[PDB]
């Protein structure tokens, strides 16, 4: 049956809504400081039908410092979500991919529909139940208003391996 994955939820609270335009991409550094696999993002739907690609970027263990332009680890075409009011669906990459203690990566999603939910009180360090602590940063890819505060990209999807 389908294999079951660990959650880690940035934020502590919702917002209003959140609104998407032709060209907006949600985007969000992050570290863990233990080695994962990386499945999948959770993403914000909600209030109708979606669209959505993700990528995974390796910014390497300076990426909290100093934000480069990265290099692309994994990508998924373009799939439509739907989930319900308040939950997140998980979008899987195509594989899972291990991430490296202590580096940065940038999670990445364009979303496309109507409004959604959306996150607020997002927290700059999550430790999960296992003892992982993740960090979260600002990313200059987003163009949407998702940062490390607010708005999409609410969860990272992970296995320990």
């Given at each position: 049956?389908?294999?079951?994955?660990?959650?880690?939820?940035?934020?502590?609270?919702?917002?209003?809504?959140?609104?998407?335009?032709?060209?907006?991409?949600?985007?969000?550094?992050?570290?863990?400081?233990?080695?994962?696999?990386?499945?999948?993002?959770?993403?914000?739907?909600?209030?109708?039908?979606?669209?959505?690609?993700?990528?995974?970027?390796?910014?390497?263990?300076?990426?909290?410092?100093?934000?480069?332009?990265?290099?692309?680890?994994?990508?998924?075409?373009?799939?439509?979500?739907?989930?319900?009011?308040?939950?997140?669906?998980a979008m899987m990459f195509d594989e899972p991919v291990l991430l490296q203690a202590g580096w940065w990566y940038v999670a990445w999603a364009r979303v496309s529909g109507p409004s959604s939910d959306c996150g607020s009180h997002g927290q700059a360090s999550i430790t999960t139940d296992d003892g992982v602590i993740f960090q979260f940063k600002s990313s200059k890819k987003s163009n949407n208003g998702t940062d490390v505060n607010a708005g999409q990209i609410p969860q990272l999807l992970y296995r320990l391996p």
């Amino acid at each position: 049956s389908l294999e079951d994955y660990s959650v880690v939820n940035r934020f502590e609270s919702h917002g209003g809504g959140w609104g998407y335009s032709a060209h907006s991409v949600e985007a969000i550094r992050f570290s863990a400081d233990t080695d994962i696999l990386l499945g999948g993002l959770g993403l914000f739907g909600g209030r109708g039908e979606y669209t959505a690609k993700i990528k995974l970027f390796e910014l390497g263990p300076d990426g909290g410092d100093h934000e480069t332009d990265g290099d692309l680890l994994a990508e998924t075409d373009v799939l439509a979500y739907d989930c319900a009011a308040r939950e997140k669906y998980a979008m899987m990459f195509d594989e899972p991919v291990l991430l490296q203690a202590g580096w940065w990566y940038v999670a990445w999603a364009r979303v496309s529909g109507p409004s959604s939910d959306c996150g607020s009180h997002g927290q700059a360090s999550i430790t999960t139940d296992d003892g992982v602590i993740f960090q979260f940063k600002s990313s200059k890819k987003s163009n949407n208003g998702t940062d490390v505060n607010a708005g999409q990209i609410p969860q990272l999807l992970y296995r320990l391996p």
